[PDB]
Subunit: 205 residues, 5 copies
């Protein structure tokens, strides 16, 4: 009850929001995916739908406290809207991403954040061959829409996508799912942008 309230108030009212990273203050976001289901394949549009949730973590001194001052509270939960979050976007969606889970984050005494939104995404993917044995292959890049390599940097803890909770009776069977950090120097833009490229190879069951 009491202390948390006092802490929450200190962090979000006694002080403004993190403004976002800059060159002189870059930030590293650890990204990782749990693919949960390939829901739909449409072969007339070339669209494929994923339901995954997406682990995001990062650390801000701005979000730091000494637990001893706040009743030995070492971490809390709060509405994502209370804090700043990175603009990690899918680079080839074909519809607005749909949000499947509460937008609630967990802050730790040391300034670090863990946020795990469930989403459903339609992205650009030609499923011709999904019925054959060697299956089909599709990718979607995820990355900061507006922050360059110099401001937001991506990182992963594994390059294996978490298939622990893939829907067992899905219409579609995952042959492999990969997540690799990639750098892209771009057109409009001198500075490189950095993304995580989700590659799934799958087929009909």
């Amino acid at each position: 009850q009491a202390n948390l309230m006092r802490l929450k108030s200190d962090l979000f009212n006694r002080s403004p929001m993190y403004p976002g990273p800059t060159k002189d203050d870059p930030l590293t976001v650890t990204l990782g995916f749990t693919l949960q289901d390939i829901v739909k394949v449409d072969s007339s549009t070339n669209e494929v739908d994923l339901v995954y949730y997406e682990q995001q973590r990062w650390k801000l001194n701005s979000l730091m406290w000494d637990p001893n001052e706040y009743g030995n509270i070492t971490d809390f939960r709060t509405s994502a809207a209370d804090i700043w979050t990175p603009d990690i976007t899918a680079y080839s969606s074909t519809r607005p991403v749909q949000v499947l889970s509460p937008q609630i984050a967990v802050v730790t005494h040391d300034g670090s954040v863990m946020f795990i939104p469930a989403q459903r995404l339609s992205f650009m993917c030609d499923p011709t061959g999904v019925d054959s044995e060697e299956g089909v292959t599709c990718a979607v890049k995820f990355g900061s829409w507006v922050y360059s390599g110099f401001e937001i940097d991506l990182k992963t803890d594994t390059d294996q996508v978490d298939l622990s909770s893939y829907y067992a009776s899905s219409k579609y069977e995952i042959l492999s799912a990969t997540q690799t950090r990639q750098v892209q120097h771009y057109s409009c833009c001198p500075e490189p942008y950095i993304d995580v490229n989700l590659v799934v190879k799958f087929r009909e069951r």
Copy 2:
């Protein structure tokens, strides 16, 4: 009019927002389901659609009062946007759950709240076999998206889902519906989450 008016401003203004449960301040939410219709079965994707309402209960101390001080009010109804509510989510939806009822809760003088969302939900369900006599079986887990079992804990009043008011001319027929409390462990997180598992076994007419 006059007395509730005073009560609502005393509960929700004098104090700052309730910050939700902690490890020191745990909560027990009681979940039940009334399952009213299986609208749709889609076997191209593997998604089934249910209309149910789900009954949530919990008690807060910070919501208590002495009815004598407020002209004998034992309870009032308030918009859910005024009180803390649990982040109970369907672990395997394929679409954002759509709300079918008012977001209004009823708080009672001893700090207990009772909140009954009506929802239409798409979830992961392979319906192969729905067209037979033995029918098919499907489950979706419900539970807190961010609070572990040491912050929020679930509980049912019975494992028998309420089917007494299930639509009589549905294209699908319910053969049984269960709600069973269970505990999960996830890779991301140190501490066990707890969920109520809704299992439905159904067929067409």
Copy 3:
């Protein structure tokens, strides 16, 4: 003009809106339906779509004024967001109702309010036999979602639904529109809840 200006701000700025009915200060709300069109029938999901508008009447003391402080104004119009509205809900929608009309209500000096939303509703209903001469029957119940008969009392003027602005060239002809008032009981709660059962009998033209 500044004479109605002062009225609105005296009623809507001087402290709060209305907090809602209670066992002690209960409220009558009169309900009537103008069935405007049966737009669609779905025989693969057993869902039917009505366009109708919903006549809602209630009298509040908090909204009362004397037109001598207020340059002889008997009434006025205002965004339904400015004042408390009842939580009347279809008990078997399969979809969140969509809004067809501006959210605006006429208020009268005696406190009495008239709000008329236009709406498309998808509800559970088996259309089997809609093409026979006998036609088909469906019912949907409207009523407060959280207020018991002790807090909200529901009234009708007629038991015939209004078919007078029913669209002449609708796909479906109306054989009888009825609005019967019922009080009934639910598993969650000891008290009577009151609802208006709309029973439409219709066939295709």
Copy 4:
């Protein structure tokens, strides 16, 4: 040089929003449609989908100014939501109207507003006969939802609908589109209620 700023806070920040048309202070609102396209015709529901521009103009004494006292500024563009707008709806839409253009109005020094929303509308329409040189005719009355003809008065510049920029490759050819101002006033009621009837006669291309 961007001092427009002043005119804006002189107008909208000087008093709460204009509270609508009284009876003593009425309002003439002019109406005009540019019909861009009939998109779809659903012969199984009974809905036609139109895409049009709705031009509306009205005059407000409370939004006028001498250009000479404001850096010689004769008109400005502003968000529709910080000026009052008329509550003109289609009386037979079957889907919430879908907004295709920004909600931004233009205000002229003399108090005139111009607002031209582009919309997609679905309305009740029997298209039996659309597949013949004959064609078919359809109708939608647009009117104020809550206001009488002593509070808001609808008017048209002309009753030839502007078809001069109607899609040349539409599946549906327009024969004619009319917009007539209709007035009705009944015995009991010292109000006239007035609406613009949008009649379109069309066939398949």
Copy 5:
């Protein structure tokens, strides 16, 4: 961190938002499109669906600063709602445009702004002959919905639509894709409106 926050409150919190351009404060927005996929073609409604980025650039004095006073911060990233943005609109759209990327913009010390919304757009276009060697041609105009030639001017860096990251496996091959500046005049208004005309000639692969 430190400086960046003081910058933002000096640009946004002291003196308000830029009110918009005027006859006396003209502005030139730069437009460029990157076509990503033709996602869908409907030949029974004559609607086609594009997925693209629109790169928008403009320069405001009020957003200019000297980096020396703000710790050599040469530029920064901020939410779209903190700044004024041009109201660039598809003229022949048939569904509300859907946004695919985060509404955030990059601001440079010289007052220059860059903003690149990613969009799925449905628009009028008959795809007859998409499945032939010749292909089919569609066009759509992008422009200010409310700012005339005298207020917002449009300009392209090139008239070639950027196809450098068009989807390798789209159903459709792009034979040509053009973006041109033009001035239009409409019944409504006595002054020029400036648009960029997107012309895509494509065929089935």
